[PDB]
Write a protein that binds this ligand. Structure first.
Ligand SMILES: COc1nc(-c2cccc(-c3cccc(-c4cnc(CNC[C@@H]5CCC(=O)N5)c(OC)n4)c3Cl)c2Cl)cnc1CNC[C@@H]1CCC(=O)N1
Lengths: 126, 126
C-alpha cells in the first residue's frame, strides 16, 4: 500500500523568509528515477512538475516562477522537498504533493504566513 | 504526455437525481488493469479508491456509503465515470479525478445542485 507521509502538516513562516515543505515516499535503497512523478500545487496552481528525472518548468504558475524548486538531492532519501524563496502573503494556503512511484498518493500541507503591516497593507490593496 | 480530459467541467444537477461525471484517459489497444489507479475526491472527501482492479471501501467517506460507484465497464474505453445516486446539496462542489496509467494527471469538475425550498431549508439548519 503506497503511502505518502508528511513530517509536518502545518508550517508558519515569516514574510520574506525561505521555506522548505516536505513530503516523504518509500524508496527501498535505490531510486528508480524513470518511475517517479512528483507534482506540487496550491489552489490548483502548478508549482513543480518532476517527470522523467527532470523538472518541467514550462507550465509552472507565474506566481512561483524563479522562486520554487524541488530539492533533487533529497529524492534518493524518499523526500520530495519543495523550497520556496522569498515567501509572500499569497503563498499562504493549502499545498498538495502528489507522488507516483509505482503506487500513487497525495498529502496536504497548510502554510500560514506572518507579515508586518507594510507588507500586509500592500497585499490588502493589491 | 499522459493527459486526463473532461467532456464537461460543469454539471448542474437536481436534488434527488442521479449524476454521472466523467474523466477520460488514453487507452491504446487493451487495458492493463493491474497498472491502473483511479481516485475520485471532493473537498478532501475520499469517494472512489480503485487500485488492483478493485474498490477499497475502507477509506471511503461515510456520506458516499452505498451511494457512489465507478462504472467499471467504461474503464476499458478509457472513461472513469463516477455515478452518485440520490444527489444532495452536500454533493455540490469541486470534484477531482486522479488517474495513474503509466503517467499521472488529474482534472477538476464543478457540480452545482439545484434544490427546492424544503430541501434547502433542511440543509440551511443542518
Ligand atoms: C487511488 O488512491 C489514491 N490515488 C491518488 C492518485 C491517483 C492517481 C494519480 C495521482 C497523481 C500522482 C502524481 C502526480 C499526479 C499529477 C497531478 N496533476 C498534474 C497536473 N499538471 C498539469 C495538467 C494541466 C492542468 C491539470 O489539471 N493537469 C500532474 O502533472 C501532469 N501529475 C497525480 Cl494525479 C494520485 Cl495522487 C491519490 N490519493 C489516493 C489515496 N487517497 C488520498 C488519501 C489522502 C491521504 C492519503 O494517504 N490518502
Amino acid at each position: 500500500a503506497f503511502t505518502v507521509t508528511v513530517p509536518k502538516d502545518l508550517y508558519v513562516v515569516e514574510y520574506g523568509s525561505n521555506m522548505t515543505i516536505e513530503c516523504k515516499f518509500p524508496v527501498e535503497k535505490q531510486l528508480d528515477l524513470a518511475a517517479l512523478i512528483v507534482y506540487w500545487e496550491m489552489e490548483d496552481k502548478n508549482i513543480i512538475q518532476f517527470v522523467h528525472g527532470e523538472e518541467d518548468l514550462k507550465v509552472q504558475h507565474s506566481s512561483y516562477r524563479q522562486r520554487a524548486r524541488l530539492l533533487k538531492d533529497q529524492l534518493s532519501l524518499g523526500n520530495a522537498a519543495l523550497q520556496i524563496t522569498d515567501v509572500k502573503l499569497q503563498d499562504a494556503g493549502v499545498y498538495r504533493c502528489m507522488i507516483s512511484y509505482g503506487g500513487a498518493d497525495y498529502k496536504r500541507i497548510t502554510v500560514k504566513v506572518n507579515a508586518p503591516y507594510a507588507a500586509a497593507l500592500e497585499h490588502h490593496h493589491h
